[PDB]
């Protein structure tokens, strides 16, 4: 019944703002890369490497998100389907954890170059959304354990509720995480030249 | 989308600055650069502006001479060239890019501005 | 950082047309193409590396092995005929570069 596509629904919603979210950032770390040069700030050589690196994988997770949300798509036009959506969890939460490592890179940049150039305010919000989200991604991680068990072997469907609200959580816990580093970059800006 | 000043005819020393207004998206969401054409030539990097953050950045062929603004209220993105001499002569384009997360590449473009800088 | 292109290819109508493009790292997904016709503003074919805009014909495609992008025609058309760049940014400093560009002739 409803349910499912309503489930199915939703997950459609998250990728969309995991997309628009990756976008934000794409925009933060061209930002920072953009600074580093006119402000002169080896280490960044390595940075640049993992920013690349952690950036194609969550440009794959996205576009595999966007082929299970087809395929789960077209079972409900149409067991399989649970599994699915299972698998559709397990996807968002890893573009969640690929994006978080994103962010806390883009947090590192901030403060190389803000040590260069009140930010006790920003650093104890920084920590606060840090703390709460590693702790929101530990839970949704301890719940997909749950929750593939169980599909190997309800339970189930009361764990992939439960995922939808972990996974949302963490989302919105993130966007609050970019508002402040935009905010960082945007303090550091306006300081060159 | 992009629509851009008109033709401009300038005196070699004088200055000239370029508009390139943006409609139908959020402001805040663009990246913006420059591109200038000699006649003739190939495509030349100027610089780039994001204007969430409003900070440019510039190909140093034309570093302190060229000088790239954005404006929040009018959604325009500006580039003014200063000291001008004959070789300056070329269209110039704004162009967008992170059209979406994951596009580099510039899907906007405006549709030149011609600058002849003669005596 | 250069981007290099042949200054000229030229293809039977109906055969396909590669446009290289060499650099020294060109990473994954920074590669993009353009159109241009006289008199006319550019116009983006590829970017990622093989991704299509909505409203580019399904007979261009292009890919990236990191030192080479390839831009491809299958079956080029008469209106393919234009110049064609390359850019993409440097990995550090975030610069654009063009490749020097290409004209492609559609003979007949």
């Known amino acids: 019944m409803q349910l499912l596509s309503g489930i199915v629904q939703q997950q459609n919603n998250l990728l969309r703002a995991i997309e628009a979210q990756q976008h934000l950032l794409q925009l933060t770390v061209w930002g920072i890369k953009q600074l580093q040069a006119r402000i002169l700030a080896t280490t960044w050589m390595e940075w640049d490497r993992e920013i690349n690196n952690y950036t194609s994988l969550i440009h794959s997770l996205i576009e595999e998100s966007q082929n299970q949300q087809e395929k789960n798509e077209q079972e409900l036009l149409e067991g399989q389907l649970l599994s699915g959506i299972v698998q559709q969890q397990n996807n968002l939460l890893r573009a969640i954890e690929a994006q978080q490592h994103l962010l806390q890179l883009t947090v590192w940049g901030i403060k190389q170059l803000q040590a260069r150039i009140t930010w006790m305010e920003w650093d104890r919000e920084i920590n606060n959304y840090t703390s709460l989200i590693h702790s929101l991604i530990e839970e949704s991680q301890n719940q997909q354990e749950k929750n593939e068990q169980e599909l190997l072997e309800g339970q189930l469907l009361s764990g992939i509720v439960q995922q939808q609200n972990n996974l949302l959580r963490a989302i919105e816990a993130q966007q609050h995480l970019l508002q402040l580093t935009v905010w960082g970059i945007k303090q550091l800006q306006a300081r060159i030249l | 989308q992009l629509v851009q000043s008109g033709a401009e005819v300038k005196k070699p020393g004088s200055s000239v600055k370029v508009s390139c207004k943006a409609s139908g998206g959020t402001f805040n969401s663009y990246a913006f650069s420059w591109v200038r054409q000699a006649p003739g030539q190939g495509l030349e990097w100027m610089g780039s502006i994001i204007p969430l953050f409003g900070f440019v950045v510039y190909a140093q062929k034309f570093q302190g001479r060229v000088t790239i603004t954005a404006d929040e209220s009018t959604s325009t993105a500006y580039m003014e060239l200063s000291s001008l001499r004959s070789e300056d002569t070329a269209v110039y384009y704004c162009?967008?890019?992170?059209?979406?997360?994951?596009?580099?590449?510039?899907?906007?473009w405006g549709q030149g501005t011609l600058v002849t800088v003669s005596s | 950082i250069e981007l290099t292109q042949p200054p000229s290819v030229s293809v039977v109508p109906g055969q396909t047309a590669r446009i290289s493009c060499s650099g020294d790292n060109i990473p994954y997904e920074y590669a993009s193409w353009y159109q241009q016709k006289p008199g006319q503003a550019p116009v983006l074919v590829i970017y990622g590396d093989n991704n299509r805009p909505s409203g580019i014909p399904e007979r261009f495609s292009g890919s990236n092995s990191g030192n080479t992008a390839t831009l491809t025609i299958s079956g080029t058309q008469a209106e393919d005929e234009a110049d064609y760049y390359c850019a993409s940014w440097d990995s550090m400093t975030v610069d654009g570069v063009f490749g020097g560009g290409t004209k492609l002739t559609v003979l007949g």
């Open positions: 162009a967008r890019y992170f059209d979406t997360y994951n596009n580099y590449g510039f899907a906007n």
